[PDB]
Write an enzyme that holds these catalytic residues in place. Structure first.
Site, PDB file in Angstrom:
ATOM      1  N   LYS A  46       0.834  -1.193   0.000  1.00 19.64           N
ATOM      2  CA  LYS A  46       0.000   0.000   0.000  1.00 19.64           C
ATOM      3  C   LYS A  46       0.873   1.250   0.000  1.00 19.64           C
ATOM      4  O   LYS A  46       1.874   1.328   0.718  1.00 19.64           O
ATOM      5  CB  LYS A  46      -0.919  -0.002   1.217  1.00 19.64           C
ATOM      6  N   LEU A  50      -0.742  10.746  -0.511  1.00 21.85           N
ATOM      7  CA  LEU A  50      -0.111  12.052  -0.380  1.00 21.85           C
ATOM      8  C   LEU A  50       1.334  11.845   0.049  1.00 21.85           C
ATOM      9  O   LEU A  50       1.613  11.119   1.003  1.00 21.85           O
ATOM     10  CB  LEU A  50      -0.876  12.885   0.632  1.00 21.85           C
ATOM     11  N   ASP A  54       9.051  11.671  -1.735  1.00 23.72           N
ATOM     12  CA  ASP A  54       9.522  11.476  -3.099  1.00 23.72           C
ATOM     13  C   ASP A  54      10.904  12.104  -3.245  1.00 23.72           C
ATOM     14  O   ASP A  54      11.053  13.312  -3.037  1.00 23.72           O
ATOM     15  CB  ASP A  54       8.566  12.093  -4.116  1.00 23.72           C
ATOM     16  N   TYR A  59      18.391  15.135  -7.495  1.00 26.51           N
ATOM     17  CA  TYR A  59      18.009  16.316  -6.718  1.00 26.51           C
ATOM     18  C   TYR A  59      19.124  16.793  -5.790  1.00 26.51           C
ATOM     19  O   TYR A  59      19.049  17.916  -5.288  1.00 26.51           O
ATOM     20  CB  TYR A  59      16.722  16.078  -5.914  1.00 26.51           C
ATOM     21  N   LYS A 117      14.658   7.423  -7.520  1.00 30.34           N
ATOM     22  CA  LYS A 117      14.651   7.307  -8.973  1.00 30.34           C
ATOM     23  C   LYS A 117      16.075   7.168  -9.488  1.00 30.34           C
ATOM     24  O   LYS A 117      16.994   7.853  -9.021  1.00 30.34           O
ATOM     25  CB  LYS A 117      13.977   8.523  -9.644  1.00 30.34           C
ATOM     26  N   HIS A 140      13.797   7.237 -13.829  1.00 36.93           N
ATOM     27  CA  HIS A 140      13.392   8.642 -13.695  1.00 36.93           C
ATOM     28  C   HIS A 140      12.853   9.207 -15.005  1.00 36.93           C
ATOM     29  O   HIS A 140      11.845   9.920 -15.010  1.00 36.93           O
ATOM     30  CB  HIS A 140      14.586   9.449 -13.183  1.00 36.93           C
TER      31      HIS A 140
HETATM   32  N1  LIG Z   1       9.537  12.380 -11.901  1.00 38.51           N
HETATM   33  C1  LIG Z   1       9.861  13.592 -12.375  1.00 38.51           C
HETATM   34  O1  LIG Z   1      10.427  13.771 -13.470  1.00 38.51           O
HETATM   35  C2  LIG Z   1       9.526  14.778 -11.523  1.00 38.51           C
HETATM   36  C3  LIG Z   1       9.503  16.043 -12.086  1.00 38.51           C
HETATM   37  C4  LIG Z   1       9.059  17.124 -11.342  1.00 38.51           C
HETATM   38  C5  LIG Z   1       8.687  16.935 -10.026  1.00 38.51           C
HETATM   39  N2  LIG Z   1       8.783  15.706  -9.478  1.00 38.51           N
HETATM   40  C6  LIG Z   1       8.445  15.504  -8.005  1.00 38.51           C
HETATM   41  O2  LIG Z   1       7.230  16.160  -7.737  1.00 38.51           O
HETATM   42  C7  LIG Z   1       7.433  17.109  -6.667  1.00 38.51           C
HETATM   43  C8  LIG Z   1       6.443  18.237  -6.769  1.00 38.51           C
HETATM   44  O3  LIG Z   1       6.633  18.978  -7.995  1.00 38.51           O
HETATM   45  P1  LIG Z   1       7.435  20.377  -8.043  1.00 38.51           P
HETATM   46  O4  LIG Z   1       8.463  20.434  -6.974  1.00 38.51           O
HETATM   47  O5  LIG Z   1       7.857  20.517  -9.455  1.00 38.51           O
HETATM   48  O6  LIG Z   1       6.327  21.503  -7.788  1.00 38.51           O
HETATM   49  P2  LIG Z   1       4.954  21.712  -6.981  1.00 38.51           P
HETATM   50  O7  LIG Z   1       4.869  20.729  -5.892  1.00 38.51           O
HETATM   51  O8  LIG Z   1       3.890  21.787  -8.023  1.00 38.51           O
HETATM   52  O9  LIG Z   1       5.169  23.195  -6.455  1.00 38.51           O
HETATM   53  C9  LIG Z   1       6.192  23.487  -5.476  1.00 38.51           C
HETATM   54  C10 LIG Z   1       6.169  24.975  -5.258  1.00 38.51           C
HETATM   55  O10 LIG Z   1       4.903  25.339  -4.667  1.00 38.51           O
HETATM   56  C11 LIG Z   1       5.116  26.073  -3.476  1.00 38.51           C
HETATM   57  N3  LIG Z   1       4.061  25.729  -2.539  1.00 38.51           N
HETATM   58  C12 LIG Z   1       3.902  24.531  -1.891  1.00 38.51           C
HETATM   59  N4  LIG Z   1       2.834  24.469  -1.136  1.00 38.51           N
HETATM   60  C13 LIG Z   1       2.245  25.712  -1.298  1.00 38.51           C
HETATM   61  C14 LIG Z   1       1.096  26.278  -0.741  1.00 38.51           C
HETATM   62  N5  LIG Z   1       0.299  25.633   0.117  1.00 38.51           N
HETATM   63  N6  LIG Z   1       0.806  27.552  -1.077  1.00 38.51           N
HETATM   64  C15 LIG Z   1       1.606  28.192  -1.932  1.00 38.51           C
HETATM   65  N7  LIG Z   1       2.713  27.753  -2.533  1.00 38.51           N
HETATM   66  C16 LIG Z   1       2.988  26.498  -2.162  1.00 38.51           C
HETATM   67  C17 LIG Z   1       6.508  25.682  -3.002  1.00 38.51           C
HETATM   68  O11 LIG Z   1       7.070  26.736  -2.200  1.00 38.51           O
HETATM   69  P3  LIG Z   1       7.947  26.479  -0.867  1.00 38.51           P
HETATM   70  O12 LIG Z   1       8.689  25.179  -1.039  1.00 38.51           O
HETATM   71  O13 LIG Z   1       8.822  27.696  -0.811  1.00 38.51           O
HETATM   72  O14 LIG Z   1       6.953  26.439   0.273  1.00 38.51           O
HETATM   73  C18 LIG Z   1       7.244  25.530  -4.330  1.00 38.51           C
HETATM   74  O15 LIG Z   1       7.663  26.787  -4.844  1.00 38.51           O
HETATM   75  C19 LIG Z   1       8.906  17.465  -6.815  1.00 38.51           C
HETATM   76  O16 LIG Z   1       9.448  18.134  -5.691  1.00 38.51           O
HETATM   77  C20 LIG Z   1       9.505  16.086  -7.057  1.00 38.51           C
HETATM   78  O17 LIG Z   1       9.538  15.385  -5.820  1.00 38.51           O
HETATM   79  C21 LIG Z   1       9.178  14.637 -10.191  1.00 38.51           C
HETATM   80  O1  LIG Z   2      13.458  15.472 -13.566  1.00 42.00           O
HETATM   81  C1  LIG Z   2      13.007  15.924 -12.520  1.00 42.00           C
HETATM   82  O2  LIG Z   2      12.486  15.200 -11.572  1.00 42.00           O
HETATM   83  C2  LIG Z   2      12.892  17.409 -12.293  1.00 42.00           C
HETATM   84  O3  LIG Z   2      13.696  18.098 -13.240  1.00 42.00           O
HETATM   85  C3  LIG Z   2      15.049  18.029 -13.011  1.00 42.00           C
HETATM   86  C4  LIG Z   2      15.569  17.926 -11.733  1.00 42.00           C
HETATM   87  C5  LIG Z   2      16.935  17.972 -11.597  1.00 42.00           C
HETATM   88  F1  LIG Z   2      17.454  17.896 -10.347  1.00 42.00           F
HETATM   89  C6  LIG Z   2      17.793  18.113 -12.649  1.00 42.00           C
HETATM   90  C7  LIG Z   2      17.259  18.188 -13.920  1.00 42.00           C
HETATM   91  C8  LIG Z   2      15.880  18.132 -14.130  1.00 42.00           C
HETATM   92  C9  LIG Z   2      15.408  18.125 -15.548  1.00 42.00           C
HETATM   93  O4  LIG Z   2      15.973  18.794 -16.408  1.00 42.00           O
HETATM   94  N1  LIG Z   2      14.364  17.345 -15.830  1.00 42.00           N
HETATM   95  C10 LIG Z   2      13.801  17.280 -17.170  1.00 42.00           C
HETATM   96  C11 LIG Z   2      14.310  16.134 -18.007  1.00 42.00           C
HETATM   97  C12 LIG Z   2      15.331  15.304 -17.568  1.00 42.00           C
HETATM   98  C13 LIG Z   2      15.788  14.259 -18.355  1.00 42.00           C
HETATM   99  C14 LIG Z   2      15.226  14.018 -19.595  1.00 42.00           C
HETATM  100  C15 LIG Z   2      14.215  14.859 -20.016  1.00 42.00           C
HETATM  101  N2  LIG Z   2      13.571  14.608 -21.299  1.00 42.00           N
HETATM  102  O5  LIG Z   2      12.725  15.403 -21.685  1.00 42.00           O
HETATM  103  O6  LIG Z   2      13.907  13.621 -21.933  1.00 42.00           O
HETATM  104  C16 LIG Z   2      13.749  15.906 -19.255  1.00 42.00           C
END
Ligand SMILES: NC(=O)c1ccc[n+]([C@@H]2O[C@H](COP(=O)([O-])OP(=O)(O)OC[C@H]3O[C@@H](n4cnc5c(N)ncnc54)[C@H](OP(=O)(O)O)[C@@H]3O)[C@@H](O)[C@H]2O)c1
Ligand SMILES: O=C(O)COc1cc(F)ccc1C(=O)NCc1cccc([N+](=O)[O-])c1
Length: 316
Positions: free
Chosen positions: A12, A16, A44, A49, A78, A111
Site C-alpha cells: 500500500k 499524499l 519522493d 536532486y 529514482k 526517472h
Molecule cells: N519524476 C519527475 O520527473 C519529476 C519532475 C518534477 C517533479 N517531481 C516531483 O514532484 C514534486 C512536486 O513537484 P514540483 O516540486 O515541481 O512543484 P509543486 O509541488 O507543483 O510546487 C512546489 C512549489 O509550490 C510552493 N508551494 C507549496 N505548497 C504551497 C502552498 N500551500 N501555497 C503556496 N505555494 C505552495 C513551493 O514553495 P515552498 O517550497 O517555498 O513552500 C514551491 O515553490 C517534486 O518536488 C519532485 O519530488 C518529479
Molecule cells: O526530472 C526531474 O524530476 C525534475 O527536473 C530536473 C531535476 C533535476 F534535479 C535536474 C534536472 C531536471 C530536468 O531537467 N528534468 C527534465 C528532463 C530530464 C531528463 C530528460 C528529459 N527529457 O525530456 O527527456 C527531461
C-alpha cells in the site's frame, strides 16, 4: 477516502507524499522532519536532486525518535539517466540507499526513459549542446530494475515520464518478470493527462501526479507563464469549499485515484498541504478543473528533444 492505494506488488502506497526537488539542502532536513511530525508517510526523492543525504538525516532521526516505524514509511527514489546501463543500476540504487540511510526503498523508478552517457555530468553534452545518449534501451534497464527486487534492495519498481508507447513497450517486454507498479508523470489542471492516465489505470499501474501546483519555483519559470495558484477560477472553487487553492490542487488528483506529491520547505505549507482528507470536490468541480487543460507542460529538457526515447513527441 482511504489514505493509501494498493499497488500491483501487494503493498500500500500513501496517496499524499512530500516532494523534494529544489528543496535546498540546508532546509530539507527540517522540511522532512516537519512533514513526518504532521502525518506524511511518503517522501519522493531522487539522486539527481542532490539532497538525498539531508532527506536521509530527517528520516533517520524520526525513526530513531520512534515518531514512525520504517514499515509505516513509503520512500521513493529514482534512477538517473546516466545510470541506465545494466552494470550501473545496482550501484546507483545503493548510493541512494546509503544517502537515505535505508536498507530498502519502497519504490524505485526509472526517472526518465532517456538514457545518457555515464560519467560525472548528469547531462553530458556534445560540443553543440545536445545530450549524449546511451545505447541502452529501456527493456534492458527494466531487467536491471527487476534484479533489485530480487536482491531485496527495493520493494517495488516503476517508471516516470513514460508515454503510453513506452509503457506498452515494458508491458510487452519478452520475459517480463515484474510489471511497473507506478508511472509518475506531470499532472495538474493545465495538463490533465486523461489519455495516459486511463491507459495506465486500465493496466493496474498507479499514477503519481508530480508538479501538482504547477512548480512555481521551477528554474525556467517566466513571468508571463500560467499560474495555477493564482487562477481566479481555481481560487473560486477553493473559496466555495473554505480551503486554499493549493488544497484544491492537491485534492483534485486524489479524487482521480492518483497519488500526489506537492513540494514545500515551508513548515506552515507542509502542514496546510496535508489537510486535504476532510473535504470533497463535486463531480462538477472535478469536470470543471479538468476543463482547464491547455497541454501546458513545465517539465521537459530542450537538450533531449532528439533523443530516440524523448517521451513528449507522442500525443500521450
Ligand atoms: N519524476 C519527475 O520527473 C519529476 C519532475 C518534477 C517533479 N517531481 C516531483 O514532484 C514534486 C512536486 O513537484 P514540483 O516540486 O515541481 O512543484 P509543486 O509541488 O507543483 O510546487 C512546489 C512549489 O509550490 C510552493 N508551494 C507549496 N505548497 C504551497 C502552498 N500551500 N501555497 C503556496 N505555494 C505552495 C513551493 O514553495 P515552498 O517550497 O517555498 O513552500 C514551491 O515553490 C517534486 O518536488 C519532485 O519530488 C518529479
Ligand atoms: O526530472 C526531474 O524530476 C525534475 O527536473 C530536473 C531535476 C533535476 F534535479 C535536474 C534536472 C531536471 C530536468 O531537467 N528534468 C527534465 C528532463 C530530464 C531528463 C530528460 C528529459 N527529457 O525530456 O527527456 C527531461
Amino acid at each position: 477516502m482511504a489514505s493509501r492505494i494498493l499497488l500491483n506488488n501487494g503493498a500500500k502506497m500513501p496517496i499524499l507524499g512530500l516532494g523534494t526537488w529544489k528543496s535546498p539542502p540546508g532546509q530539507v532536513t527540517e522540511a522532512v522532519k516537519v512533514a513526518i511530525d504532521v502525518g506524511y508517510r511518503h517522501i519522493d526523492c531522487a539522486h539527481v536532486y542532490q539532497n538525498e543525504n539531508e532527506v536521509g538525516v530527517a528520516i533517520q532521526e524520526k525513526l530513531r525518535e520512534q515518531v514512525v516505524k520504517r514499515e509505516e514509511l513509503f520512500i521513493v527514489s529514482k534512477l538517473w539517466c546516466t545510470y541506465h546501463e545494466k552494470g550501473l543500476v545496482k550501484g546507483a540504487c545503493q548510493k541512494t540507499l546509503s544517502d537515505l540511510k535505508l536498507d530498502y526503498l519502497d519504490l524505485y523508478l526509472i526517472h526518465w526513459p532517456t538514457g545518457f552517457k555515464p560519467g560525472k555530468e548528469f547531462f553530458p553534452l556534445d560540443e553543440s549542446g545536445n545530450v549524449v545518449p546511451s545505447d541502452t534501451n529501456i527493456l534492458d534497464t527494466w531487467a536491471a530494475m527487476e534484479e533489485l527486487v530480487d536482491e531485496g534492495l527495493v520493494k517495488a519498481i516503476g517508471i516516470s515520464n513514460f508515454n503510453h508507447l513506452q509503457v506498452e513497450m515494458i508491458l510487452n517486454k519478452p520475459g517480463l518478470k515484474y510489471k511497473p507498479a507506478v508511472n509518475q508523470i506531470e499532472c495538474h489542471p493545465y495538463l490533465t493527462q486523461e489519455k495516459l492516465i486511463q491507459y495506465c489505470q486500465s493496466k493496474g499501474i498507479v499514477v503519481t501526479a508530480y508538479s501538482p501546483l504547477g512548480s512555481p519555483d521551477r528554474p525556467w519559470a517566466k513571468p508571463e507563464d500560467p499560474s495555477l495558484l493564482e487562477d481566479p477560477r481555481i481560487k473560486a472553487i477553493a473559496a466555495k469549499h473554505n480551503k486554499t487553492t493549493a488544497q484544491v490542487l492537491i485534492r483534485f488528483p486524489m479524487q482521480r485515484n492518483l497519488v500526489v506529491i506537492p513540494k514545500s520547505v515551508t513548515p506552515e505549507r507542509i502542514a496546510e498541504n496535508f489537510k486535504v482528507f476532510d473535504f470533497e470536490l463535486s463531480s462538477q468541480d472535478m469536470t470543471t478543473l479538468l476543463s482547464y487543460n491547455r497541454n501546458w507542460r513545465v517539465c521537459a529538457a530542450a537538450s533531449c528533444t532528439s533523443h530516440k526515447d524523448y517521451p513528449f513527441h507522442e500525443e500521450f
